[PDB]
């Protein structure tokens, strides 16, 4: 048991099937020799496979994960993309909250700030009460 997984930029990774197989999309692939993944760079891939090793089992979000995801925006998304792609039904969730956690209890100006999204808005800005 060991599957070889190849990142976008050449790099090849050995994971025990035990802790892969945690990606559904790869697991299903197995029933049904590197596997190429030309849509994750191996910085992510790395990170992914750590998440998997630590979760070879299975709001708030477990402390360890909390911690893991204490990463630059960029890298977040790149997980919350891979995760989806690999159907690591588990990691995506906790990633997704992390982000939402970010949006939570901010002001438009503020979220727009921290997410470096530009103010689209003309006019006024339709204000209704609840």
């Amino acid at each position: 048991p060991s599957i070889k997984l190849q990142s976008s930029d050449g790099e090849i990774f050995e994971v025990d099937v035990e802790i892969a197989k945690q990606s559904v999309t790869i697991k299903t692939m197995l029933e049904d020799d590197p596997v190429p993944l030309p849509n994750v760079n191996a910085a992510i891939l790395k990170k992914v496979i750590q998440w998997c090793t630590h979760h070879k089992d299975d709001d708030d979000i477990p402390v360890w994960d909390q911690e893991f995801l204490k990463v630059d925006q960029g890298t977040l998304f790149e997980l919350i993309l891979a995760a989806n792609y690999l159907d690591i039904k588990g990691l995506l969730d906790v990633t997704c909250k992390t982000v939402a956690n970010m949006i939570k209890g901010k002001t438009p100006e503020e979220i727009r700030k921290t997410f470096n999204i530009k103010n689209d808005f003309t006019e006024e800005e339709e204000a209704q009460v609840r």
């Binding site: 919350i80 993309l81 989806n84 995506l92 997704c96 909250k97 982000v99 939402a100 949006i103 939570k104 209890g105 901010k106 002001t107 438009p108 979220i111 727009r112 999204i117 530009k118 103010n119 689209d120 808005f121 800005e125 339709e126 609840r130």
Partner: peptide
């Protein structure tokens, strides 16, 4: 996916704040 993220918030806040961030 953007939904999934968004899905995660208090409707209060979706209506109140998010709808004010940007057009999309």
């Amino acid at each position: 996916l953007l939904l999934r993220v968004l899905a995660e918030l208090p409707a209060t806040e979706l209506v109140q704040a998010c709808r004010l961030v940007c057009l999309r």
